């Protein structure tokens, strides 16, 4: 393969290069909105963000080496997680605010689902206090992609490959922290701190996926065909 032969700095350069763009929402301050319309803003934004995430996933080292069936599965499991960590990353420099899009800033008081917002706000607040680096962010985001659905025959050969690639990203994270002058103790701690966030991001995803289900059944918030197929695989 090629993912295993990459150096830590090559790994970082590859991930930074593959970074998806920041899209705008359809939000209009002169247009009235409703609980359902504001929800439509998020789902619509997420829908065309998925098309960029797919091309982003292809450029993640080791991902394209996997079978098309496994690639589909990994994205069906982590797409909301990846979206959320992307949200809290760009929401860091906005205390008490969530930056869904450059033209869409929402705080806790616009809780159309306060609980999910507060969790996202807390996660973003955690990143701000840790002074999360962009290099660390793209590592964490790629970890989520490869890890979120790795636990669902010669298929085991692929599982070990993901484990191998995951170990590479671990060394890459440690490489960054060592480069940042952190002591060996601080490197272990920061690594642990960063990965414990992923447990919470997974939690926020599961909570969000349940709300996404209710929006489908209530049939008032527009859900694209792709989002429906994403949700359907999660409720399989």
């Amino acid at each position: 393969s090629l993912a295993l032969s990459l150096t830590a700095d090559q790994m970082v350069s590859a991930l930074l290069d593959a970074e998806p763009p920041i899209l705008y929402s359809e939000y209009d301050p002169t247009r009235p909105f409703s609980e359902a319309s504001m929800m439509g803003l998020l789902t619509n934004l997420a829908d065309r963000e998925l098309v960029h995430m797919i091309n982003w996933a292809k450029r993640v080292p080791g991902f394209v080496d996997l079978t098309l069936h496994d690639q589909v599965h990994l994205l069906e499991c982590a797409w909301l997680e990846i979206l959320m960590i992307g949200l809290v990353w760009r929401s860091m420099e906005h205390p008490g605010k969530l930056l869904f899009a450059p033209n869409l800033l929402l705080d806790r008081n616009q809780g159309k689902m306060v609980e999910i917002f507060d969790m996202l706000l807390a996660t973003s607040s955690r990143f701000r206090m840790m002074n999360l680096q962009g290099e660390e962010f793209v590592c964490l985001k790629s970890i989520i992609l490869l890890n979120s659905g790795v636990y669902t025959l010669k298929s085991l050969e692929e599982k070990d490959h993901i484990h191998r690639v995951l170990d590479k990203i671990t060394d890459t994270l440690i490489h960054l922290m060592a480069k940042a002058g952190l002591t060996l103790q601080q490197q272990h701690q920061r690594l642990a701190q960063l990965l414990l966030i992923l447990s919470h991001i997974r939690h926020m995803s599961n909570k969000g996926m349940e709300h996404l289900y209710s929006m489908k059944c209530k049939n008032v918030v527009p859900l694209s065909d792709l989002l429906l197929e994403m949700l359907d695989a999660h409720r399989l």
Binding site: L50, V51, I54, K58, L68, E76, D225, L226, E229, M230
Partner: peptide, 10 residues
Amino acid sequence: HKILHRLLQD
């Protein structure tokens, strides 16, 4: 069959 499948296959 899936949309995600078609887009990954591109």
